[PDB]
Amino acid sequence: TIPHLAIDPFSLDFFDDPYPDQQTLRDAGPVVYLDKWNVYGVARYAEVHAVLNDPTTFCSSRGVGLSDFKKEKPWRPPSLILEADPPAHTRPRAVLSKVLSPATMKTIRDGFAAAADAKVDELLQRGCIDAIADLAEAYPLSVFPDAMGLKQEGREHLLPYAGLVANAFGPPNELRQTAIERSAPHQAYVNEQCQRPNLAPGGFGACIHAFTDTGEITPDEAPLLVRSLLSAGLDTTVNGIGAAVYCLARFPGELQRLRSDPTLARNAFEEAVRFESPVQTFFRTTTREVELGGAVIGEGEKVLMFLGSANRDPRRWSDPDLYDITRKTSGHVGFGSGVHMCVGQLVARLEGEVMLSALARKVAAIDIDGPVKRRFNNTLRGLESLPVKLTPA
Ligand code: HEM
Ligand SMILES: COc1ccc(C(=O)O)cc1
Numbered sequence: 041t042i043p044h045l046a047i048d049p050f051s052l053d054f055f056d057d058p059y060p061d062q063q064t065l066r067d068a069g070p071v072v073y074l075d076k077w078n079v080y081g082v083a084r085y086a087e088v089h090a091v092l093n094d095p096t097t098f099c100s101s102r103g104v105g106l107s108d109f110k111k112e113k114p115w116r117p118p119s120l121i122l123e124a125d126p127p128a129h130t131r132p133r134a135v136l137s138k139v140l141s142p143a144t145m146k147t148i149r150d151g152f153a154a155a156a157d158a159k160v161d162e163l164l165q166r167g168c169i170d171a172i173a174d175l176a177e178a179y180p181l182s183v184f185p186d187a188m189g190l191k192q193e194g195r196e197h198l199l200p201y202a203g204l205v206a207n208a209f210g211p212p213n214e215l216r217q218t219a220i221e222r223s224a225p226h227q228a229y230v231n232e233q234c235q236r237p238n239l240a241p242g243g244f245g246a247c248i249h250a251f252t253d254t255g256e257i258t259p260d261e262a263p264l265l266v267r268s269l270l271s272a273g274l275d276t277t278v279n280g281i282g283a284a285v286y287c288l289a290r291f292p293g294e295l296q297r298l299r300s301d302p303t304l305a306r307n308a309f310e311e312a313v314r315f316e317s318p319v320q321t322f323f324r325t326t327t328r329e330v331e332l333g334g335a336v337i338g339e340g341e342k343v344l345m346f347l348g349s350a351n352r353d354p355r356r357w358s359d360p361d362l363y364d365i366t367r368k369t370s371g372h373v374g375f376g377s378g379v380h381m382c383v384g385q386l387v388a389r390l391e392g393e394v395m396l397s398a399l400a401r402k403v404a405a406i407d408i409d410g411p412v413k414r415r416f417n418n419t420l421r422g423l424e425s426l427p428v429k430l431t432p433a
């Protein structure tokens with residue numbers, strides 16, 4: 041009934057160009073079986089969206105990577121939000137929602153925007169820059185650790201720790217083995233910064249620790265909730281901003297439209313998230329026998345969701361392989377969907393919007409002028425190097 045495929049969605053050849061294999065996964069059927077890892081797969085928008093929005097059947101508390109926490113010990117203590125189901129998910133989620141609230145975004149937006157404008161101004165003085173290291177990485181590193189309340193020392197551990205977490209969702213391949221081998225110094229830094237004395241007043245971390253008296257979370261849960269923001273709060277924003285710059289460099293007609301109307305900045309970033317989906321995949325585990333796409337999936341099975349493929353599914357999107365900054369992006373699953381939908385999405389969108397706004401106002405052309413290098417990770421898509429020449433407006 042359900043087709044079996046030998047495609048390894050965690051192989052370097054797949055990461056190098058995933059789009060043809062994603063069509064093969066979509067067109068084989070609504071539900072596929074991936075013999076390489078003994079998991080079910082869904083690559084069309086409909087089933088990906090359905091799975092995301094049925095958390096009681098497709099649970100997260102047995103892990104959202106390949107490993108099933110009922111069979112293997114997690115490599116680190118489970119996230120209290122990502123790797124929890126309702127009802128235990130619910131109140132920690134509320135605390136993170138309030139810490140990263142619209143009111144919080146309003147407090148920090150002017151400073152985030154000034155830092156974006158300053159970065160672009162600085163980059164225009166140099167002309168030829170690496171849009172990853174010098175822009176997509178440098179800008180989030182210039183705002184988010186300070187907004188967390190982190191000290192200056194040790195911040196070089198943030199991106200490595202985040203890449204470790206993302207690689208550890210994958211199967212036990214070399215990317216995962218090597219990440220875990222190298223983990224100890226990054227993990228030691230991150231866990232220490234999660235303690236209350238180490239988070240500056242008013243920042244995201246301090247506000248989590250201040251939220252420990254309402255009956256929603258306890259003081260001993262605050263360090264792991266800070267850990268969630270330190271795990272997730274940087275590298276996908278980096279990849280999304282780098283993707284937007286890549287798209288504006290590859291599709292100059294869209295940079296021309298963005299320049300003509302800088303209010304398209306927010307949707308231009310949202311479209312970049314759909315187009316390049318910084319998080320390519322997440323898993324769920326079935327809690328019961330379930331019918332999905334005409335298939336009967338037993339209890340205790342891993343289901344791999346292809347978010348990036350769902351965001352390029354022609355069953356859902358017109359011209360899905362075109363970058364269109366005026367596209368109606370609502371409903372894309374680059375941030376997930378449902379109760380786990382990215383609690384930090386307002387932070388990522390704020391950073392992406394104000395960076396693209398600075399580019400829209402200050403830059404006339406973005407020309408690739410060197411070899412583009414891909415960054416490989418079991419669950420993240422992104423670039424390692426993006427040499428561009430920036431021409432001032
Ligand atoms: C473009 C940037 C980002 C992308 C593409 C992204 C992607 C995602 C996705 C797809 C999920 C759903 C997980 C699931 O369904 O199992 C998620 C959840 C989450 N994200 Fe993000 N994210 C981004 C930025 C951020 C930022 C900036 C933060 C923190 C400031 C963050 C923190 C979290 C957390 C804590 C969760 C777990 C929420 C829950 O389980 O209820 N993310 N993210
Ligand atoms: C990749 O997205 C996430 C989301 C949450 C967490 C976490 O809660 O630690 C890590 C990565």
Ligand SMILES: [Cl-]
Nearest residue numbers: 115116117227
């Ligand atoms: Cl850890």
